[PDB]
Design a binder for this molecule. Sequence first.
Ligand SMILES: Nc1nc(C(=O)O)c(CCc2ccccc2)s1
Ligand SMILES: [Zn+2]
Ligand SMILES: [Zn+2]
Length: 231
Amino acid sequence: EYPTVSEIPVGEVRLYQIADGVWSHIATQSFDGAVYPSNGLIVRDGDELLLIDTAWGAKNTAALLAEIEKQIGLPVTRAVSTHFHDDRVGGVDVLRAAGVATYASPSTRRLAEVEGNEIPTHSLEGLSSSGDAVRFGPVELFYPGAAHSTDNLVVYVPSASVLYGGCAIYELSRTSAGNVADADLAEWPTSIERIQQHYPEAQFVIPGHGLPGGLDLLKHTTNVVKAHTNR
Ligand SMILES: Nc1nc(C(=O)O)c(CCc2ccccc2)s1
Ligand SMILES: [Zn+2]
Ligand SMILES: [Zn+2]
């Protein structure tokens, strides 16, 4: 079964096999007085691993590398952060110290610098406009436009029809927006529509936080978003 927030002590990381050569990683961290789970992705890249997002902090991210080495045993050589918040770039310095080449869009790297967060080393070209997609090893990176954040990316694994929505996609059970301080509430439904249009075949959809679902998570998130927008 997919691991839940209460089953993961802060500082520990679980891996979950979604498909051949595709895992999510699950960690937990405190924010504003409560503890939340957070998802990232791991994808086999030939003889190497591509990492999508940190495990939300330096300590969790170190535990992530240890768990990858224990359970999979291939080297993590590249990492992509899908926006500038700490559940995506917090731990980048650990990754870099461990030998991992870290990447993000120019906009994410800039927003991280402005925020005082950790800054991935390398800039990803070709994602500056809503609807842009680029290939990055075994995944496609896609900028759907502003949503949870202005810089947020989603990731698609064609080999397994796995769509990683990051924090622009909410889990089914989540019915309130919570904190959306950096969100573009007006653009977010349009951005989810681009995701739907571009990955109509997705079979597994992983939100940034919580339980995986299917394409139903997109409409679900749009419903939550405008509700918070509708009063
Ligand atoms: N770093 C973090 N991002 C987010 C986010 O919204 O992207 C957090 C709130 C997530 C949440 C809320 C309710 C239930 C389960 C999870 S915390
Ligand atoms: Zn975020
Ligand atoms: Zn988040």
